[PDB]
Design a protein around this nucleic acid. Structure first.
Length: 48
DNA sequence: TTTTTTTTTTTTTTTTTTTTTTTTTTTTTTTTTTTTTTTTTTTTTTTTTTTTTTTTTTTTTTTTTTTTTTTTTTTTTTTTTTTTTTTTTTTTTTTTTTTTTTTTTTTTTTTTTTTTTT
């Protein structure tokens, strides 16, 4: 369960993951996202 | 009772190999330096009515040099073949899940002994 929050003051967008699937480790999920960002397999991510 | 044959581990130290300490080259990483975006206000630029004298298009006619034109022979175009690259099925390998089998390490505290350095 995630939403693309859109700022009102500026046009920048931030994705917020409210919930996570079952039997998924959050630390490994964040590490995998960081690995994809470093390898440029997923584009558009600014921060994490 | 004396004397004779044979067997191996040691005096071994040297040759071969292995193990363990080393430091050149392409791939990371922190720094400074240059591209981007948002506000203030500011003289400055720029949008929109009115008048005006202008200078280019439309009555009409003229020609000549680009539009007609036909035809020879080139030469770009197309065909077949083969190589190089791109891209996707296929396979392999690895990781995570939850109950099982196995293990392995770092320090305090005192007192006494080995074990090196001066």
């Amino acid at each position: 369960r995630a939403e693309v929050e859109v700022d009102a003051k500026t046009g920048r967008e931030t994705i917020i993951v409210h919930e996570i699937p079952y039997q998924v480790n959050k630390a490994r999920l964040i590490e995998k996202i960081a690995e994809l960002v470093k390898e440029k397999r997923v584009e558009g991510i600014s921060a994490l």
